[PDB]
Ligand binder design. Structure first.
Ligand SMILES: Nc1ncnc2c1ncn2[C@@H]1O[C@H](COP(=O)(O)OP(=O)(O)OP(=O)(O)O)[C@@H](O)[C@H]1O
Ligand SMILES: [Mg+2]
Ligand SMILES: [Zn+2]
Ligand SMILES: [Zn+2]
Ligand SMILES: [Zn+2]
Lengths: 196, 180, 65, 559, 158, 264, 43, 114, 160, 133, 86
RNA sequence: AUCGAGAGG
């Protein structure tokens, strides 16, 4: 996730040759979708990319301190002295084609952080599993190889779909299926049955 | 900071005390501390009720009397319109918390996303301390090549985030590439 | 903790430069950017790897064990 | 409530989900390790046994494998352990628990169980990487934007159950929503932006790109489109390749703005026989909305054609967009200096009007509407002035923003962005609203300790002139933070309340079902509706249309 | 004019026009009598409920009334000839398609209506975001609770 | 001279070569550049076994650092891929083995450089596995800095590799491409708030090409024959060799396709 | 680490909402997200 | 964990045919060739040379997924031109051009003095 | 209001209409006054409308109020879904709450009532009641684990 | 193999339109009072002037895959500069004795007027537009 | 209470199979095909039981009686062959 | 287990 509000999973790892290449040849370590930004309404992510590029080419450290007077136009002028676009919009060549991309792509140095949450820890799959004895139900959690909870509201979605048997197999065969003998005369399971 | 009449009502601390503070800071002679400012009385501690009684100015420059081109990009600032200010706040950034101080430009960004980054940064991996190889904590995560942020708040040098960074300055391009 | 070997985007080595660069900024009182130019690390990503990097290894080295 | 209604269930898996454009919408990408963990019992059959022999040979570690074989006696045989597993004979009437295999039905669910649509059956496609993969479109009914979103998959253990999932819970069957009578899934994100850009007449496609896109359509006619322009150079409009993607035999007419048949604005659309005569593709045609192309395709051609169409459109458009590229950029936020000066003058005018109304209030010479306190009237008028000022400022900016800037392109497609986002970044974020009110004086007479006493002026009240790009003054930032805090509280409060509500509604209405007499009855059989929905008809297959007799002149009706 | 409608007639007519490649110059083959009688026959052969009970037949007639009105608006003898030069066969095809589409449109017996209705409220309600009235989730809570107290009671006097 | 693509080199350095390529199909220049990054084979350490590690850096971290260090690959074609080779773990032809043992004797923080690394496997007269140092001091890239009283003992085995498997094996870090600098082809539409010319800098590569006359119409047929490129070499493989090897590797891939068709 | 050390927790007439009194003493934007949002604040 | 090896993309395993050739459906001369363990950079080259040849009506390259390095190219040829023959000629032409460039570059480097 | 009425021609035209909005509701008194149309008048509270005009007017007003909420969103829900809830409250002569008061209290079933709230109290009273549960309800069937007479389960399937 | 209609037109107006490459063209028939044409042309493809006379022809011929031009195989169906292929969205009559013809080529739009050429205008979707200097 | 027969001449129910009915019939037949119970239809090229059940339903080979039910509980029976599928 | 705390959507 970025230092600004936006967070994300990496959908794919792309080799450098595939990734679009500027004339300078810098390949972005990270590619983010444009469509996320306008609804996020965080201009400062864009601002940070611009300021960091200016700072890196100058070598000078760049101050983002809040409530300190900064001109995006001034930073743009500094980028123009560097020769990089005031926008930071960079002409990019599509990697597989070698063709120039029709629309130039924003290219900036963005601070980014690695979130603690990771897939490899998170994933849990249990086809069959240990059962807590009294419930006879699946145990809870990855550590105990536990079965995921089927919500009653989830059950409601299933009823709305109308399939009695999927709900039934999840409800009895998958968890705490049980056979008993109830006495008809008592109406109550007073009966204990020796089958042998 | 305390502001009292002299001629024009001016911040009490003045340039000279700052120069002496910086001289003591460079030394690492006459000793200058925050307690010295308080003994001098230039700076005072104000509780919320006392704050209701006081009238304060964000900017030290705003208190000094104002007597025409302005750059368009500069944020529109209402003139304070107030004759007398008891005190002047040291910096707006000081009201912001440490996690807010981390955010590059909260001033240019929406508040909810600032909150979300504050939440994410505690989760974000960084080297916790130099003692870690000696230490045995139950779970620790350390970045392979921690890199200081390219854009730093003035608050961060006090926060020591630059010294123990939690992020990498990845080159980031905003593009549509096969929908991932 | 230690100077990265290469700029991840470029892949150009950055390990050799660092020591010189530090001495360099003290030797000529040079601004960091001109020192980067002398290093030849022209790509701002190559520059980025050095400027953003800090050596925490010295701090780990201070520990006696 | 927690064990009998809901049970932790076997064969339940969860993963972080990521979206893959190539994968078809009906299919879910299942990480290989989970599929290997997960077993489905398959009875050996004469056709089945020969394949199953090899799958047992490949074993637990490699899929197609089998964790267990089940005897007629049914004492468990553990395959990974078994020495005999090398030498087993498959026998008949013996159930082999297959590793989960591609093109096998499963159920994929986002944790909000608000919707039946949220739990949808998907075809299994086994993928190497660990993340569950899903189409970009199928996100919308799931309501999952997967920055960290985790989704849960349940595998049927019975063939009757598998049949129920495939025959009723499939994504194609759930495309058209029972409620709101509109498709649930539409083309999303870069596919929509790129479909708009491709459809523009200005955009043109060369023959090499045309051939690659033709090839990209999984089913192609094999007949190269006749060039839209032949003689100067063979050129193809983007609409023609997109039309090759459109299922043949489908006709769409759309008129919202003045949509002449000439259609110089190119608003609206005519498709004939899966070939599009005029228009630039916009969100509504390609949208979840009723009268969208997806609704027409799903009803006209059946559901499977619609889902495949989703896929084909996504592939062609994404390829085109990847060739053109897209970047939001800083400069789309930046605004022209002339327009910025007009913007500042607008804000100043609103400020002077607020002061003049305040002065009239100070004079005590005022007109108070009956049933409105005079302070109430003053505050309402001032609040309206500031609201109108921010909206007008944004509108001036929107006109100023050029056709080329990307935020407008995202909005014109309708992919992402809105006028309010444009306005707040461009000119003015507006007055902060707390508890349906302008910012209050926590200190008596002062909104902020910096602010002077008894100030009802907009700056004290916290209406923020400043653009996000321009930057925010500290007071403005604190006001925005107060409003945001209230908003987040209300977000969580609304969720909790909706949970209690939705549960109450479901518990009340669970018993009620259509019956064969078509009476709509509870479990007792008390008839809520003699004919369900007072039409005795499914909510699906109902599209709004104009009734011609009503409306118009009486003379027009007779003529 | 716009109301939820069981079958989209205009789509059927457009599909017919392209399918039969109809020309406007050629006179309609179709008898005026046959247009009127066929529209009436199509109205007759749509059943929300099977069988004949006078109450059941009447409840169906009430049920089909709005759809019948839509069909009469969509196909008038004069309108049938003017809007399109329907071959008599294309009109018969339109009739068959309309009947079949309505039959598909009828709810399959046994679908659980109430759970669907509750979810159908719920997702808007989850997404539901909050001249002054009780609004949104609080207003909905008042409606559902049937509480006597109203935060903003109001009477509309006409 | 030869009919077909003709290349004129603007600049020759051991690190980098800047050339102008004419009468080339662009897809071929892109194909060659992607081959040049990925397909060119080079030797880097694929296995590191550490006897003892006292340094603060973890062994995996050190091993990674070692993997990135440049190893000379002029004779890498003579070397055989280990998976191709008959030996078990390593034969001397497939594997070049480098050992380093460093103890922090110095009170001053010890420094471990690429120059300290030494080879224990017979060269057999091929110039392979020598650490390459461009430093004026000749001080190698620092794998680790050693505290006084700290000793790290490791052996490293270097196997043939390709960049598609891992980034370290790729010989060339940066490759610069410029085509249609004047935008006569108009492949890309510039984003300009007011004027395109002021917002986008003129490329130096524009200057070589004659500026387009305003009167002439845009021609749909034309595809740019001339591209301006520059290659940057680590120097594990020299620049001239690097570009020739990229060309040759593409030829080998094409020949494999042709032979596969003949076998079919 | 630093942020966890400076924390305020309010047991539980609108405590969550930012107050004018809160200005200059509490971070405007650092708050729990989810249930008990705004009850807990960082100085 | 679940992720596949870089080498698996790199090299053919389990006796994968490097080239699979199957008839196209609905175009008479067209044929589809599945390159296996092959990357984009060769495929666009083969296709460009195929486009250059007058006789091939259709040439396109498509990859089903980025995950797996399988590349599909479809060629439709004029009548009297075998598709496989067309592919051979295009590939040989690429090789000739590559050799010509290498020789010209070698001469140029010898001319270069640095 | 600015409501639209038929023209003499019959083209729908719009006439400005004068209206009054009242803070309080006293429906019976307001309706028996001059200068108002008794037919047109409406009360935002559904219960007052139901008491003055009967249950069916109350159900109409209930759907109208739910519709106003959904319209404030701009969302649209098909009339059948809202209608079913309104009719469930309406079919019982008194307007019936979604809350446990009333909805759980409706006699039919024992387990369907027990699931929502006050489970054990319901079961205790039922034990004293000696209530017989058909177990026809979906939630009841889930508790049994027996296949519910729901969707696919409802119709019996027999051999030829 | 007969052109369905041939016309000589003088273009009244060039409109740049929303799209820069494709400009709208407003044109009046020469020697006919009642024939009017509104076309979408590509200015990059075709030089245009505010006043200009261009020959306009519609042909049924000179499905089938577009075959790449082989110069020996190719006989120019036309020496005309500009050719488009497309389908009429509608044939209408603005007035009695005044047929209006609407032809679209990949979304590019064409308006034609008069009943002298309506017999020349045909129901079949296929059309080739030929524009000559 | 008992023998709540619905005359075969006097049945009113939707002739079309409920989608739930088709799903249950197809799944039951597929279970039988997995059970390896004899399949009447000629089968070409499908292992899967569900595909076979679908073909058998289109053939109408599947003999099954679906008891259309009413809230009263009088039982009307529609043979699979009788019920229209489309 | 239990209870708590914290965190993700
Ligand atoms: N319904 C929506 N309409 C418009 N934009 C949206 C919507 N939902 C999310 N976005 C936008 O998508 C991006 C990421 O989603 P966002 O940050 O809102 O997630 P979230 O609200 O935390 O998620 P969740 O819906 O799971 O609670 C942001 O730009 C956000 O504005
Ligand atoms: Mg999310
Ligand atoms: Zn008993
Ligand atoms: Zn670099
Ligand atoms: Zn070997």
């Amino acid at each position: 996730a970025s230092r600004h509000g936006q967070k994300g999973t990496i959908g794919i790892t792309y080799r450098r040759e595939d990734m679009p290449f500027t004339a300078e040849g810098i390949v972005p370590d990270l590619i983010i979708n444009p469509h996320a930004i306008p609804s996020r309404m965080t201009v400062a992510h864009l601002i940070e990319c611009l300021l960091s590029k200016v700072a890196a080419l100058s070598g000078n450290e760049g101050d983002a301190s809040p409530f300190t007077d900064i001109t995006v136009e001034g930073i743009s002028k500094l980028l123009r002295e560097h020769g990089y676009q005031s926008r930071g919009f960079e002409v990019m060549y599509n990697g597989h084609t070698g063709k120039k991309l029709m629309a130039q792509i924003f290219f900036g140095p963005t601070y980014y952080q690695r979130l603690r949450h990771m897939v490899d820890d998170k994933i849990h799959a249990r086809a069959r599993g240990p059962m807590q004895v009294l419930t006879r139900q699946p145990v809870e959690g990855r550590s105990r190889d536990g079965g995921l909870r089927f919500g009653e509201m989830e059950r409601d979605c299933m009823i709305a779909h109308g399939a009695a048997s999927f709900l039934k197999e999840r409800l009895m065969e998958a968890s705490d299926a049980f056979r008993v003998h109830i006495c008809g005369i008592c109406g109550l399971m007073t009966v204990i049955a020796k089958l042998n | 900071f305390i502001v009292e009449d002299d001629g024009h009502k001016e911040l009490k601390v003045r340039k000279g005390h700052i120069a002496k503070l910086m001289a003591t800071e460079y030394q690492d002679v006459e000793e200058y501390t925050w307690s010295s400012l308080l003994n001098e009385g230039l700076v005072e501690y104000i509780d919320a009720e006392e704050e209701e009684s006081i009238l304060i100015a964000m900017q030290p420059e705003d208190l000094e009397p104002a007597e025409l081109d302005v750059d368009p990009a500069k944020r529109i600032r209402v003139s304070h319109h107030a004759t007398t200010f008891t005190h002047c706040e040291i910096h707006p950034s000081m009201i912001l918390g440490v996690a807010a101080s981390i955010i590059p430009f909260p001033d240019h960004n929406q508040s909810p996303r600032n909150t979300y980054q504050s939440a994410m940064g505690k989760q974000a991996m960084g080297v916790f301390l130099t003692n870690y190889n000696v230490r045995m904590d139950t779970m620790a995560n350390i970045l392979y090549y921690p890199q200081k942020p390219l854009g730093t708040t003035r608050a961060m040098e006090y926060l020591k985030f630059r010294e123990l960074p939690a992020g990498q300055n990845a080159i980031v391009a905003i593009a549509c590439y096969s929908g991932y | 903790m230690i100077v990265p070997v290469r700029c991840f985007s470029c892949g150009k080595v950055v390990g050799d430069k660092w020591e010189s660069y530090l001495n360099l900024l003290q030797e000529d009182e040079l601004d960091e950017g001109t020192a980067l130019s002398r290093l030849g690390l022209k790509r701002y990503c190559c520059r980025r790897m050095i400027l953003t990097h800090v050596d925490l290894i010295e701090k780990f080295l201070r520990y006696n064990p | 409530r927690g064990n009998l209604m809901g049970k932790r269930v076997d064969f339940s898996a969860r993963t972080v989900i990521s979206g893959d454009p190539n994968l078809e919408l009906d299919q879910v990408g299942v990480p290989k390790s989970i599929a290997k963990t997960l077993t489905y019992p398959e009875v050996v059959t004469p056709y089945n046994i020969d394949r199953l022999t090899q799958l047992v040979r490949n074993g637990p570690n490699e899929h197609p494998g089998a964790k267990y074989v089940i005897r007629d006696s049914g004492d468990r045989i553990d395959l990974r352990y078994s020495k005999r597993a090398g030498d087993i004979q498959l026998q008949y009437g013996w159930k082999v628990e297959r590793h989960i295999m591609d093109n096998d039905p499963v159920l994929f669910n986002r944790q909000p169980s608000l919707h039946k649509m949220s739990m949808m059956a998907h075809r299994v496609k086994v993928i190497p990487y660990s993340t569950f993969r899903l189409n970009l479109s199928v996100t919308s009914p799931y309501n999952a934007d997967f920055d960290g979103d985790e989704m849960n998959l349940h595998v049927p253990q019975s063939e009757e159950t598998r049949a129920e999932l495939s025959q009723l819970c499939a994504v194609p069957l759930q495309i058209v929503s029972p409620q709101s009578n509109k498709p649930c899934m539409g083309i999303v994100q870069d596919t929509l932006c790129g479909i708009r850009k491709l459809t523009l007449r200005d955009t043109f496609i060369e023959l090499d790109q045309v051939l690659n896109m033709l090839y990209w359509v999984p089913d192609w006619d094999g007949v190269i489109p006749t060039p839209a322009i032949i003689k100067p150079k063979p050129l193809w409009s983007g609409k023609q390749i997109l039309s090759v993607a459109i299922p043949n035999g489908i006709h769409l007419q759309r008129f919202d703005e003045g949509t002449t048949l000439l259609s110089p604005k190119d608003n609206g659309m005519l498709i004939i026989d899966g070939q599009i005569i005029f228009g630039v593709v916009e969100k509504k045609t390609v949208g979840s909305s009723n009268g969208g192309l997806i609704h027409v395709v799903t009803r006209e051609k059946g559901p499977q054609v619609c889902a495949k169409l989703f896929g084909n459109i996504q592939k062609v458009v994404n390829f085109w967009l990847l060739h053109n590229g897209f970047s939001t950029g800083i400069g789309d936020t930046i605004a022209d200096g002339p327009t910025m000066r007009e913007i500042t003058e607008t804000i100043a005018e609103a400020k002077k009007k607020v002061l003049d109304v305040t002065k009239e209030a100070q004079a005590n010479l005022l007109t108070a509407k009956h049933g409105m306190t005079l302070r109430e009237s003053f505050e309402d008028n001032v609040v309206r002035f500031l609201n109108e000022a921010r909206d007008k400022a944004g509108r001036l900016a929107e006109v100023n923003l050029k056709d080329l800037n990307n935020v407008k392109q995202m909005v014109m497609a309708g992919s992402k962005g809105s006028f309010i986002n444009i306005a707040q970044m461009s000119a003015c974020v507006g007055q902060q609203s707390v508890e349906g009110k302008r910012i209050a004086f926590g200190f008596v007479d002062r909104t902020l300790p910096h602010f002077s006493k008894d100030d009802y002026s907009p700056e004290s009240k916290g209406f923020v002139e400043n653009s996000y790009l321009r930057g925010l003054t500290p007071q403005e930032f604190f006001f925005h933070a107060m409003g945001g805090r209230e908003g987040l509280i209300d977000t969580a409060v609304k969720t909790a309340e909706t949970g209690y509500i939705q549960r109450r509604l479901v518990k009340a209405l669970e018993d009620i079902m259509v019956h064969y007499d078509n009476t709509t009855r509870n479990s007792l059989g008390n008839v809520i509706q003699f004919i369900y929905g007072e039409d005795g008809m499914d909510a699906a297959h109902i599209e709004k249309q104009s009734l011609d007799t009503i409306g118009g002149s009486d003379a027009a009706f007779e003529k | 004019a716009n109301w939820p409608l069981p079958v989209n007639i205009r789509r059927i007519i457009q599909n017919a026009q392209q399918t039969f490649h109809i020309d406007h110059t050629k006179p309609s083959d179709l008898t005026i009598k046959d247009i009127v009688l066929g529209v009436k026959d199509l109205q007759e052969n749509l059943l929300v409920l099977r069988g004949k009970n006078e109450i059941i037949q009447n409840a169906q007639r009430d049920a089909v009334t709005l759809f019948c009105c839509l069909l009469r608006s969509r196909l008038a003898t004069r309108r049938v000839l003017q809007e399109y030069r329907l071959t008599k066969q294309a009109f018969d095809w339109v009739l068959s398609n309309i009947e079949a589409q309505f039959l598909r449109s009828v709810v399959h017996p046994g679908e659980m209506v109430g759970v669907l209705a509750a979810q159908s409220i719920g997702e808007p309600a989850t997404q539901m975001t909050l001249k002054k009235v009780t609004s949104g989730v609080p207003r909905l809570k008042e409606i559902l609770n049937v509480a006597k107290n109203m935060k903003t009671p109001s009477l509309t006097v006409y | 001279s030869e009919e077909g693509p003709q290349v004129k080199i603007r600049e020759a350095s051991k690190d980098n070569v800047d050339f102008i390529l004419s009468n080339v199909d662009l897809a071929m220049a892109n194909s060659l550049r992607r081959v040049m990054i990925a397909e060119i084979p080079t030797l880097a350490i694929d296995s590191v076994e550490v006897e003892t590690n006292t340094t603060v850096l973890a062994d995996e971290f050190i091993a990674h650092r070692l993997g990135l260090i440049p190893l000379q690959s002029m004779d890498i074609e003579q070397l055989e891929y280990s998976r191709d080779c008959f030996c078990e773990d390593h034969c001397d032809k497939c594997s070049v083995v480098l050992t380093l043992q460093a103890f922090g004797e110095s009170e001053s923080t010890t420094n471990v450089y690429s120059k300290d690394l030494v080879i224990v496997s017979n060269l057999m007269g091929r110039n392979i596995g020598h650490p390459i140092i461009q430093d004026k001091e000749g001080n190698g890239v620092l794998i680790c800095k050693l505290r006084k009283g700290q000793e790290l003992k490791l052996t490293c085995v270097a196997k043939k590799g390709i960049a598609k498997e891992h980034a370290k094996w790729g010989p060339a870090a940066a490759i610069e491409f410029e085509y249609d600098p004047w935008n006569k082809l108009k492949h890309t539409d510039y984003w300009y708030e007011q004027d395109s010319a002021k917002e986008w800098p003129q490329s130096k590569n524009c200057e070589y090409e004659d500026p387009p006359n305003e009167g002439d119409p845009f021609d749909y047929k034309a595809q740019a024959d001339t591209f301006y490129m520059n290659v940057e070499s680590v120097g594990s493989i020299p620049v001239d060799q690097v570009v020739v090897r990229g060309i040759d590797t593409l030829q080998k891939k094409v020949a494999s396709i042709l032979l596969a068709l003949t076998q079919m | 680490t630093l942020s966890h050390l400076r924390r305020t927790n309010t047991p539980i007439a609108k405590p969550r909402q930012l107050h004018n009194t809160h200005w200059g003493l509490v971070c405007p934007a650092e708050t729990p997200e989810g249930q008990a949002c705004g009850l807990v604040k960082n100085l | 964990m679940n992720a596949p090896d870089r080498f698996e993309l790199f090299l053919l395993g389990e006796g994968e045919s490097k080239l699979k050739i199957d008839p196209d459906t609905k175009a008479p001369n067209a044929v589809v060739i599945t390159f296996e363990k092959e990357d984009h950079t060769l495929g666009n080259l083969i296709r460009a040379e195929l486009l250059n040849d007058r006789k091939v009506l259709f040439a396109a390259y498509k990859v089903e997924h980025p995950f797996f390095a399988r590349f599909k190219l479809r060629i439709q040829t004029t009548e009297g031109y075998d598709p496989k023959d067309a592919l051979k000629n295009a590939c040989n032409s690429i090789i000739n051009k590559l050799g010509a460039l290498k020789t010209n570059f070698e001469t140029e480097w010898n001319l270069q003095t640095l | 209001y600015d409501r639209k009425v038929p023209s003499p021609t019959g083209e729908y035209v719009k006439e400005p209409e004068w209206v009054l909005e009242t803070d309080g509701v006293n429906l019976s008194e307001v309706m028996t006054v001059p200068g108002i149309d008794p037919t047109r008048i409406y009360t935002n509270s559904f219960i007052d409308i139901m008491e003055v005009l009967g249950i069916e007017a109350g159900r109409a007003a209930l759907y109208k109020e739910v519709y106003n909420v959904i319209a404030s969103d701009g969302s649209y829900v098909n009339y059948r879904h809202m209608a079913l809830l309104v009719d469930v409250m309406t079919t019982q002569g008194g307007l019936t709450s979604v809350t446990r008061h009333g909805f759980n209290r409706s006699n039919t079933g024992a387990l369907m009532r027990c699931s929502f709230e006050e489970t054990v109290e319901i079961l205790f009273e039922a034990g004293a009641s000696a209530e017989l549960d058909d177990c026809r309800g979906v939630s009841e069937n889930v508790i049994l684990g027996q296949m519910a007479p729901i969707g696919t389960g409802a119709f019996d399937v027999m051999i030829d | 193999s007969n052109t369905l209609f041939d016309d000589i037109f003088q273009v009244s107006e060039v409109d740049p339109g929303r799209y820069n490459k494709v400009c709208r063209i407003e044109a009046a028939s020469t020697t006919q009072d009642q024939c009017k044409l509104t076309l979408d042309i590509n200015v990059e493809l075709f030089p245009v002037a505010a006043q200009d006379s261009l020959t306009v022809t519609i042909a049924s011929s000179l499905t089938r895959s577009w075959r790449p031009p082989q110069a020996g195989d190719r006989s120019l169906a036309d020496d005309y500069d500009y050719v488009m292929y497309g389908t009429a969205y509608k044939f209408e009559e603005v007035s009695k004795d005044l047929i209006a013809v609407y032809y679209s080529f990949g979304g590019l739009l064409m308006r034609l007027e008069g009943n002298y050429r309506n017999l020349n205008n045909l129901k079949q979707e296929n059309a080739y537009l030929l524009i000559r200097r | 209470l008992k023998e709540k027969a619905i005359p075969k001449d006097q049945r009113a129910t939707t002739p079309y199979m409920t989608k739930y009915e088709r799903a249950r019939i197809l799944g039951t037949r597929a279970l039988q095909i997995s059970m390896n119970a004899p399949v009447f239809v000629d089968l070409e090229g499908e292992t899967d039981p569900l595909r076979i059940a679908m073909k058998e339903l289109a053939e109408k080979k599947i003999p099954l009686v679906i008891r259309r039910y009413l809230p009263d509980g009088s039982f009307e029976d529609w043979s699979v062959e009788e019920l229209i599928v489309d």
